[PDB]
Amino acid sequence: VRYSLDPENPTKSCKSRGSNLRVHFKNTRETAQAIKGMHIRKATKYLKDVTLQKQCVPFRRYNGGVGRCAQAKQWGWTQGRWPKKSAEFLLHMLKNAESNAELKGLDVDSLVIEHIQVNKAPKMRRRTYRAHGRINPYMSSPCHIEMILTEKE
Amino acid sequence: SELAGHQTSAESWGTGRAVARIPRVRGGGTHRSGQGAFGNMCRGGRMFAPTK
Amino acid sequence: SMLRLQKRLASSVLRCGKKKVWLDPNETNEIANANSRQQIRKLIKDGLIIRKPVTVHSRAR
Amino acid sequence: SSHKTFRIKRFLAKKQKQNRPIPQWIRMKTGNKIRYNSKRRHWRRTKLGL
Amino acid sequence: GVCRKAAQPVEAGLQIPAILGILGGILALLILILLLLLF
Amino acid sequence: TKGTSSFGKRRNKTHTLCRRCGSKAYHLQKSTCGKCGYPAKRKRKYNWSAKAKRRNTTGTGRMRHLKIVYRRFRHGFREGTTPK
RNA sequence: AAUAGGGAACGUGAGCUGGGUUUAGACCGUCGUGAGACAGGUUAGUUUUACCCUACUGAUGAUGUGUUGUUGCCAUGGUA
RNA sequence: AACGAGAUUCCCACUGUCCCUACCUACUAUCCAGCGAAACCACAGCCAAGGGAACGGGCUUGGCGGAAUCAGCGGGGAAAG
RNA sequence: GUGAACAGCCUCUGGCAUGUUGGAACAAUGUAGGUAAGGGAAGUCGGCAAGCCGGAUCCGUAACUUCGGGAUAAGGAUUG
RNA sequence: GUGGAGCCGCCGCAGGUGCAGAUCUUGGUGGUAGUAGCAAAUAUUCAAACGAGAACUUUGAAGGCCGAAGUGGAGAAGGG
RNA sequence: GACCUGGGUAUAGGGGCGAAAGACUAAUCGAACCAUCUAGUAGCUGGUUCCCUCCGAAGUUUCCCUCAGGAUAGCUGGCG
RNA sequence: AAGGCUAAAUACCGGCACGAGACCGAUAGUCAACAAGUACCGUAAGGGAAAGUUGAAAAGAACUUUGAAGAGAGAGUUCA
Ligand SMILES: O=C(c1ccc(-n2nnc3cccnc32)cc1)N(c1ncccc1Cl)[C@@H]1CCCNC1
Ligand SMILES: [Mg+2]
Ligand SMILES: [Mg+2]
Ligand SMILES: [Zn+2]
Numbered sequence: 001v002r003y004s005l006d007p008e009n010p011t012k013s014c015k016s017r018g019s020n021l022r023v024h025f026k027n028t029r030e031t032a033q034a035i036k037g038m039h040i041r042k043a044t045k046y047l048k049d050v051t052l053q054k055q056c057v058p059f060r061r062y063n064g065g066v067g068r069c070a071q072a073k074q075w076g077w078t079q080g081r082w083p084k085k086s087a088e089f090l091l092h093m094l095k096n097a098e099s100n101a102e103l104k105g106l107d108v109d110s111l112v113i114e115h116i117q118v119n120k121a122p123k124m125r126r127r128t129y130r131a132h133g134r135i136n137p138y139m140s141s142p143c144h145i146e147m148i149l150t151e152k153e
Numbered sequence: 154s155e156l157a158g159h160q161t162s163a164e165s166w167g168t169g170r171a172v173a174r175i176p177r178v179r180g181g182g183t184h185r186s187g188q189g190a191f192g193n194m195c196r197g198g199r200m201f202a203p204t205k
Numbered sequence: 206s207m208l209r210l211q212k213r214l215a216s217s218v219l220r221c222g223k224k225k226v227w228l229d230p231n232e233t234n235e236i237a238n239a240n241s242r243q244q245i246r247k248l249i250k251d252g253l254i255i256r257k258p259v260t261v262h263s264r265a266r
Numbered sequence: 267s268s269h270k271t272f273r274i275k276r277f278l279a280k281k282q283k284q285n286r287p288i289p290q291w292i293r294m295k296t297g298n299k300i301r302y303n304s305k306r307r308h309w310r311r312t313k314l315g316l
Numbered sequence: 317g318v319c320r321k322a323a324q325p326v327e328a329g330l331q332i333p334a335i336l337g338i339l340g341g342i343l344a345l346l347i348l349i350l351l352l353l354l355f
Numbered sequence: 356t357k358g359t360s361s362f363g364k365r366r367n368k369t370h371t372l373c374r375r376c377g378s379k380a381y382h383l384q385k386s387t388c389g390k391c392g393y394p395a396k397r398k399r400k401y402n403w404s405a406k407a408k409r410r411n412t413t414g415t416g417r418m419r420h421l422k423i424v425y426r427r428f429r430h431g432f433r434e435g436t437t438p439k
Numbered sequence: 440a441a442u443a444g445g446g447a448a449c450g451u452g453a454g455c456u457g458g459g460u461u462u463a464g465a466c467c468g469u470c471g472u473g474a475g476a477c478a479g480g481u482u483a484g485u486u487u488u489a490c491c492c493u494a495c496u497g498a499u500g501a502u503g504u505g506u507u508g509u510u511g512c513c514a515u516g517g518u519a
Numbered sequence: 520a521a522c523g524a525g526a527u528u529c530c531c532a533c534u535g536u537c538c539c540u541a542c543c544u545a546c547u548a549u550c551c552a553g554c555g556a557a558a559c560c561a562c563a564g565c566c567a568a569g570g571g572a573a574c575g576g577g578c579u580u581g582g583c584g585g586a587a588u589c590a591g592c593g594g595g596g597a598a599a600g
Numbered sequence: 601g602u603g604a605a606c607a608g609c610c611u612c613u614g615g616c617a618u619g620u621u622g623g624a625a626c627a628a629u630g631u632a633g634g635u636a637a638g639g640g641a642a643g644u645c646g647g648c649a650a651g652c653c654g655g656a657u658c659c660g661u662a663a664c665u666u667c668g669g670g671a672u673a674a675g676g677a678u679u680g
Numbered sequence: 681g682u683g684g685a686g687c688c689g690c691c692g693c694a695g696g697u698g699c700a701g702a703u704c705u706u707g708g709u710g711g712u713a714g715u716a717g718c719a720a721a722u723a724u725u726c727a728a729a730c731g732a733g734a735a736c737u738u739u740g741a742a743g744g745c746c747g748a749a750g751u752g753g754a755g756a757a758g759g760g
Numbered sequence: 761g762a763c764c765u766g767g768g769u770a771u772a773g774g775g776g777c778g779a780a781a782g783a784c785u786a787a788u789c790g791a792a793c794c795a796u797c798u799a800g801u802a803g804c805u806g807g808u809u810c811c812c813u814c815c816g817a818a819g820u821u822u823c824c825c826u827c828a829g830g831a832u833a834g835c836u837g838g839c840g
Numbered sequence: 841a842a843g844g845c846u847a848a849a850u851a852c853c854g855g856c857a858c859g860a861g862a863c864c865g866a867u868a869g870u871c872a873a874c875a876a877g878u879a880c881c882g883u884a885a886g887g888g889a890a891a892g893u894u895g896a897a898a899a900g901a902a903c904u905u906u907g908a909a910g911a912g913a914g915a916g917u918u919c920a
Contacts, residue, residue, distance in 0.1 A: 019911065066714075078500065103905055160405070173806095178887080186881085212739090348485065365786085370883055406877085
């Protein structure tokens with residue numbers, strides 16, 4: 001398919017993709033800000049400590065009602081949350097971002113995450129049950145992702 | 154459209170519940186449950202002065 | 206490896222309730238094999254599903 | 267009911283056979299556009315009325 | 317099978333809880349708070 | 356008790372499915388039918404519901420013996436065998 | 440010591456309470472042929488939602504000073 | 520007389536109704552993990568006086584004003600239904 | 601089993617995972633359950649709420665009365 | 681720049697001929713918002729297995745609950 | 761005990777039924793629901809889609825079961 | 841007059857076939873261009889939708905890698 005901003009160093013920069021993966025959008029977007037521009041083997045070591053609640057992920061845009069925590073002072077912010085499902089999937093395919101990279105003959109120990117974006121998926125539906133005999137929808141909000149991994153030289 | 158465009162049987166809500174006083178269809182069930190009935194405004198409705 | 210079928214089939218051939226049946230978890234891939242009723246009666250004869258008798262309700266006091 | 271007359275269980279035999287998935291090859295055929303059976307009556311969702 | 321749950325069933329239904337979700341909300345004069353305003 | 360706890364006493368059916376029309380309308384207490392009026396001789400159709408004719412006119416069934424009239428008529432009801 | 444008078448959408452119902460008024464039940468009196476009427480009387484009578492912004496009360500904070508910490512001064516604002 | 524989930528007054532005993540509040544437990548609320556709606560919505564949201572459709576948030580003239588926020592809160596939005 | 605008892609409480613036979621989820625901490629505010637010295641309705645439209653008495657035995661019983669009732673009246677004493 | 685098979689000017693003729701509103705109609709999507717919420721009926725815990733993966737499955741051992749007007753064993757009606 | 765309850769049957773819209781509240785009659789009752797006559801009538805609210813250029817007012821008379829409206833004149837425009 | 845018959849010119853929005861249209865072009869046209877009086881609701885009378893388009897051709901992505909799979913990366917098909 002076609003990405004956004006196909007790479008300027010096209011032989012020596014790798015790329016991956018995942019579509020219609022059931023995570024929240026507002027928790028997959030805001031774990032993607034926190035690793036944007038980070039070296040991969042530190043970013044892989046980052047997302048493990050998110051799920052083990054050692055090193056949080058700050059919420060900068062979608063900060064409605066999010067309770068404070070102390071680990072967010074590293075990122076200059078007061079609110080944080082530890083997504084152990086959202087930082088699972090894009091841990092699970094930074095595995096599959098570099099599994100393509102050395103398949104193209106690239107030294108993976110110099111990769112940094114250049115580009116990453118999250119964009120929503122068609123919201124699949126099921127229904128709730130409310131008062132006075134009314135129905136409202138439980139709408140899941142899944143999301144696509146997209147990423148470019150670039151060696152620095 | 155000669156005369157028939159009115160083979161959908163309906164009535165107005167008749168009270169200020171929170172919708173317009175346009176005729177709404179009856180029943181339940183299908184997606185044509187409380188939609189707009191005849192009148193020139195509405196989807197699936199009659200036309201203004203249907204030609205003769 | 207479900208054993209819910211053996212839990213049901215034993216408590217109609219031992220004439221007992223579903224609770225009281227069954228000790229011995231060591232031959233688990235042996236008692237999961239037999240899903241019949243005639244092949245489940247060998248496991249009583251081999252002593253792998255036992256009766257495990259009734260809880261005590263002494264009328265001493 | 268389990269006390270049913272004959273003209274019910276030869277009606278229930280008809281609403282049990284026609285509640286069935288499609289064979290897969292007819293989706294491949296020429297000149298159709300159907301891709302899933304939509305008349306599948308699910309026994310808790312949608313009920314018959316006798 | 318392989319594609320009997322993943323390519324037969326994924327078109328079968330997948331919009332069947334949207335049997336509208338409601339028929340209108342016929343809640344029938346919920347101004348039960350009798351108010352009567354000073355007469 | 357007027358509402359949802361009254362629906363729990365809905366247990367015995369009233370309209371079983373009829374024998375001629377086949378429409379779930381055979382009223383069992385009164386031994387008649389809704390759409391066709393079964394113990395009557397004539398078929399209950401009316402003009403006030405102009406669609407209910409359209410559900411059950413000639414042409415909405417199979418027309419098993421008027422696929423045979425509307426084809427034999429256009430040759431004039433021949434009765435002989437054929438020529439070889 | 441004094442038991443001063445007042446206002447703030449007749450301060451104050453997503454603060455409460457329902458006693459009276461002011462629905463539908465009912466009784467008496469007077470008026471009316473009658474249905475019913477009665478600032479005449481009595482008894483019985485469902486009180487909805489704050490998660491939005493603001494105000495406020497608390498709580499991390501933010502900028503500017505090179506990073507950072509300790510000890511401090513006080514413009515102001517409150518007031519017994 | 521009896522009887523009454525009937526209505527009213529007093530007395531005895533009693534008590535947190537109160538003087539005057541305090542403490543303890545459970546389930547919440549709170550925070551994290553996962554799933555995640557609706558109500559409502561011109562644009563939005565600091566105040567005083569003035570005039571004005573005679574009681575503004577937005578105009579006039581003044582007083583003044585910092586990001587993004589959480590737990591509450593029931594004065595206002597002549598709030599919402 | 602206890603007890604007059606198919607009352608409540610507990611256990612075996614026979615069932616299930618606490619009712620469409622858990623982990624951590626134990627603020628306000630509620631929700632449900634309690635206790636409180638001294639006073640005892642002063643609260644409030646109102647003794648509403650909560651409390652008090654509650655089973656058995658032996659005593660003991662008034663006004664009134666249609667002579668059946670009031671009545672388990674009230675007021676006590678005992679209870680392992 | 682996409683697009684892949686039809687279109688426009690001029691003289692005349694004919695219109696279901698032009699949208700910001702109608703608590704418009706159908707359809708779509710936010711803001712609220714990762715917020716409210718997942719709180720009626722006491723309660724789970726340890727090891728092993730199958731497994732890519734276990735607070736929620738199975739199996740055990742223990743702790744419990746319903747407690748014979750049952751959270752048990754069976755039917756009518758209804759469900760098919 | 762003027763007691764409670766299952767199934768069968770009867771009574772149908774100006775009609776059923778009522779130990780009487782205008783309750784009940786499929787969440788609908790001071791007259792049920794479904795379809796048509798019917799797109800029922802409305803002196804009454806809500807709306808009524810392109811641009812420029814020229815001219816540009818009226819709330820008064822008389823009469824009306826007229827006072828939220830219409831007729832008549834007045835005032836306006838277009839055509840000569 | 842108190843008995844009777846009768847083709848033609850004439851009416852047709854149901855029926856079998858047809859032909860044409862200064863029409864409508866998928867929220868239009870009938871409700872229905874498709875498995876529409878179908879899915880669905882209502883005890884019943886009855887109410888009743890949504891939904892047309894790959895390409896010229898299926899030539900519908902063989903094969904290799906990662907992951908349990910969804911899904912990616914290469915390769916390929918096609919002018920695309
Ligand atoms: O449930 C309700 C109830 C309460 C409010 C609404 N309202 N009011 N405005 C509304 C706008 C939208 C939606 N609902 C609305 C509806 C119902 N009750 C109730 N309470 C008091 C009076 C009348 C009732 Cl019916 C029951 C009755 C018995 C006690 N338990 C609760
Ligand atoms: Mg100072
Ligand atoms: Mg469309
Ligand atoms: Zn019939």
